[PDB]
Amino acid sequence: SSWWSHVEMGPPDPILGVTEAFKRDTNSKKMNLGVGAYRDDNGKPYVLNCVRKAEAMIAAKKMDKEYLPIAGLADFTRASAELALGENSEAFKSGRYVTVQGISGTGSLRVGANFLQRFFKFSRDVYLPKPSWGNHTPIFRDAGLQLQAYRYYDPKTCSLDFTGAMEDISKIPEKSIILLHACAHNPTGVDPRQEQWKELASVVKKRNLLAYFDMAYQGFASGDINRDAWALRHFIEQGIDVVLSQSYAKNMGLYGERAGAFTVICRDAEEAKRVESQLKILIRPMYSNPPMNGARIASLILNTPELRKEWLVEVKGMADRIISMRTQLVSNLKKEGSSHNWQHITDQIGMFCFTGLKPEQVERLTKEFSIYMTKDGRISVAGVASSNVGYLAHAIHQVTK
Amino acid sequence: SSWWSHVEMGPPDPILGVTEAFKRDTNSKKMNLGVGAYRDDNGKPYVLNCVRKAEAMIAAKKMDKEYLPIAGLADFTRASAELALGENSEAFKSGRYVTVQGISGTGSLRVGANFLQRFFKFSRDVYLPKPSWGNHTPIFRDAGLQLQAYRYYDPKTCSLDFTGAMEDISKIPEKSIILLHACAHNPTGVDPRQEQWKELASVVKKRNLLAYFDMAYQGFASGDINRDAWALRHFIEQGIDVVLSQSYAKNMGLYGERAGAFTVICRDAEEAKRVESQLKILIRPMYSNPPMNGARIASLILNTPELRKEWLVEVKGMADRIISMRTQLVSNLKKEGSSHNWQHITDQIGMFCFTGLKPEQVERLTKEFSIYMTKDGRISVAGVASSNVGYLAHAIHQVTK
Ligand SMILES: *Cc1c(COP(=O)(O)O)cnc(C)c1O
Ligand SMILES: *Cc1c(COP(=O)(O)O)cnc(C)c1O
């Protein structure tokens, strides 16, 4: 019947827009700098070698497809917490942590979000940085929480507005919830330094806030997995009990397999067992049990010395390629005879880059060079390759000189 | 910190409670009739043959791990809609339907539930049969819907309470939501007959109710995929635009891979396009995109004539196995000299069977014969084997004589 007559067509996605437009375009010189996934030097999706190995191993075993437990694969969840906290870490050693398998980063974030909605009696506000990953808004909003914001990115220098963020944090009502990106901020690429994180911790500790870490790029950011979780660790060390979402989408390139986790740092193991129980009660009516393929794969790798050694080599290779590209892009702009400062492009970490380009410059980049990106000036370094970085440098100079 | 000091231990689950207990038992003759997943004549998990074929094909192809669209894998949703509606189905040829991939049946039901909450303006009430799958309550409840019920199962005869149901349904306020199991009712095993379905459909049309079909056993119930979907079809042919949830967990044995779909029948292809945009919007903030493994396999099977042909043979194979055990259970009861009426056991369809045993009888079975089942009298037919059906019939005789 006419049950759905009142349902309107939802707005379009800009990003998707960017991609379709890239598709039509008949310039063979076209570049898609909108891509939100890694790409190798040949502009192709990259399936890691340790992943193909883990896969063949699973195959070789004729494993069943039986339902996994609500909280996920135990070998997987433990390994995840281990990867985040560190092996000789107090939180880990004493087991006061609770880790659940989620549907990649997103579902992990979502589950935590609904956890807070249900049990965090202290507040309803979630502080997100300006700007933050697009999906962050509706996630917390649909879970039924309210959104607020703290200054983070600085448009004048395309770096961190330390002054502005401290000021804002110093003013957040005690017991509020603050969301922090562990590394490789998305979408700017701007991450605080160590001294700056020390400061941020003190104050977060001070005003007694609940820190919610979104760790979607451990290993993939600097190529060092310890280095990448420094901020998260420092926070716990300082006695701050965080909450965290992990995703294996990028670091292991497990994109569509959906492997991730959500962890809660509790006072002790007792309480952790309590928290785990409510987490299961919350998860069951959402999807019952999580998808097994991706967890099995990540598990084998973290838990099998030979594959893990190899994994570390590969992730480092991915970060190295991106870093090189950033590197090459600046050096080519100097070579084109650009007189503007482009250090931010190398100061920035991870897959995304806030170029600082204005909307009119971006329109021109599109129309004249067939370089497709979002109007915010953001670029996905993954779309850059040895074979096109020159051209790209060339076009930037041209729309900016 | 003490953030979670007020979070209490969640209450223990009973099903989990019986297998746990079943595990600790030393009786060599013990049986687990609490299992919610198919088992072979050997009490082992069964990864279908076609499934194994599908996986190596997938492996030979060297496919990537790139994200799937938010709505899922196109060949999987198309294929999935075809199987339910039927190939020369008006509704299917006309394109007036919308199918989205979910995280198995549970995930699909949840997405459905959440869509109803958002856009079904006519009512927040959801009518569940008495009884229904345990997970159905929290599903609708966490979504934000109110729960109601209708009579369905006659405890006096262990069959359908057709009168109580019709009476009850007649009375449901127009435009309310009614949840229906397509076939193989869980947990009773009680399904209406074709004639009773026409009658139910005629009242459902009348009252202008929104029917929500939960289809988690197509092909798995009778062993015939058309027959198992007759009711869903009849309602549509009756001009009833339903909503549906599908699961590939049992019919394909995809359990832990989590493959399923949610479908909405709309007035026309134009209206569907609109309903599809709102589902994507609701989905992104839940888990971004679905898990690829299960869908890949399932699509390949549905899509390759040669594997579909084998799948059919295999699923008949499974339903046949369950029919046989019910038949055997009955006949062995007769021959032990049991005088109770056990016809319900054969009249019932599916992997679950409401035996009519009383808690005190169930208790004897456990302590004395090591037969583990739930106190409500529900037995999972998958846990019965050609080599224990004999032991089962005798024990039931001893506890009921
Ligand atoms: C990629 C990303 C995630 C998680 O993505 P998934 O594919 O769901 O694992 C979470 N947060 C940020 C900031 C991301 O960039
Ligand atoms: C099995 C089942 C489902 C779906 O199970 P999933 O594992 O989530 O696919 C839904 N409804 C009923 C009544 C079932 O028995």
Token duo for residue B52 = 């194994």
CB A187 within 8 A of CB A378: yes
Under 8 Å between Cβ of B291 and A324 = no
Torsion angle in degrees (nearest 10) through CA of A248, A252, A257, A261 = -20
* Alpha carbon of A278: minimum distance to chain B alpha carbons (Å): 6
- CB contact B59 to A (< 8 Å): yes
- For residues B366 and B355, give the distance between their C-alpha atoms in angstroms, rounded to a whole number: 15
- The pairing of strands A243-247 and A259-265 is antiparallel
d(CA B94, CA B270): 11
Determine the CATH number of domain A13-46+320-400.
3.90.1150.10
Distance CA B315, CA B222 (A): 10
Residue A262 φ then ψ, to 5°: -125, 125
Q: How far is A264 from chain B (nearest CA, A)?
A: 10
Cα nearest neighbour of A123 on chain B: B3
Atom of ligand 2 nearest to the CA of B104: 9
- Cα Rg, chain A, nearest whole Å: 22
Report the relative pairing of strands B159-160 and B153-154 from DSSP bridges: antiparallel
State residue B372 phi and psi, 5-degree precision. Answer: -100, 120
Measured in Å, residue B68 CA sits from the centre of ligand 1 at 14
Q: Return binding residues of A for substrate.
A: 36, 133, 186, 378
A267 touches chain B (CB under 8 A): yes
Q: Do A289 and B257 touch (CB under 8 A)?
A: no
> For ligand 2, what atom is nearest to the CA of residue A67?
7
Please identify among residues 142-181 of chain A the ones whose CB lies closer than 8 Å to any CB of chain B.
Answer: 142
Residue B106 is nearest to which of A37, A241, A288, comparing CB atoms?
A: A288
| Binding site membership of B214 for ligand 2 (Cβ less than 6 Å) | yes
B244 touching chain A per CB within 8 A? no
State the structure-solving technique: X-ray
User: Does any ligand 2 atom lie closer than 6 A to the CB of residue B133?
Assistant: yes
| PDB resolution in Å | 2.2
Cα–Cα dist A49/A41, whole Å: 16
Task: Report the nearest-CA residue for atom 12 of ligand 2.
Answer: B216
Whole-angstrom Cα distance, residue B212 to residue B25? 41
**Does A269 touch chain B if contact means CB atoms closer than 8 Å?**
no
Q: How far apart are CA A280 and CA B343, in angstroms?
A: 39
Residue B188 beta carbon below 6 angstroms from any ligand 2 atom: no
A110 close to B (CB below 8 A): yes
**Letter for the amino acid at B16?**
L
What angle is formed at CA A90 by the lines to CA A231 and CA A193, rounded to 5 degrees?
10
3-state secondary structure chain A: CCCCCCCCCCCCCHHHHHHHHHHHCCCCCCEECCCCCCCCCCCCCCCCHHHHHHHHHHHHCCCCCCCCCCCCCHHHHHHHHHHHHCCCCHHHHCCCEEEEEEEHHHHHHHHHHHHHHHHCCCCCEEEEEECCCCCHHHHHHHCCCEEEEEECEECCCCEECHHHHHHHHCCCCCCCEEEEECCCCCCCCCCCCHHHHHHHHHHHHHCCCEEEEEECCCCCCCCCCCHHHHHHHHHHHCCCCCEEEEECCCCCCCHHHCEEEEEEECCCHHHHHHHHHHHHHHHHHHHCCCCHHHHHHHHHHHHCHHHHHHHHHHHHHHHHHHHHHHHHHHHHHHHHCCCCCCCHHHHCCCCEEECCCCHHHHHHHHHHHCEECCCCCEEEHHHCCCCCHHHHHHHHHHHHC
Q: Please give, one letter per residue, the 3-state secondary structure of chain B.
A: CCCCCCCCCCCCCHHHHHHHHHHHCCCCCCEECCCCCCCCCCCCCCCCHHHHHHHHHHHHHCCCCCCCCCCCCHHHHHHHHHHHHCCCCHHHHCCCEEEEEEEHHHHHHHHHHHHHHHHCCCCCEEEEEECCCCCHHHHHHHHCCEEEEEECEECCCCEECHHHHHHHHHHCCCCCEEEEECCCCCCCCCCCCHHHHHHHHHHHHHCCCEEEEEECCCCCCCCCCCHHHHHHHHHHHCCCCCEEEEECCCCCCCHHHCEEEEEEECCCHHHHHHHHHHHHHHHHHHHCCCCHHHHHHHHHHHHCHHHHHHHHHHHHHHHHHHHHHHHHHHHHHHCCCCCCCCCHHHHCCCCEEECCCCHHHHHHHHHHHCEECCCCCEEEHHHCCCCCHHHHHHHHHHHHC
Is residue A200 a contact partner of residue A230, using CB atoms and an 8 Å limit? no
Using CB atoms, pick whichever of A2, A282, A287 lies closest to residue B103. Answer: A287
Domain ranges (residues) in chain A: 13-46+320-400, 47-319
Residues 6+ apart with CB under 8 A from A285: B106, B110, B135, B138, B139, B141, B142
Pairwise CA distance, residues A44 & B66, whole Å:
11
CATH T-level fold of B47-319: Aspartate Aminotransferase; domain 2 (3.40.640)
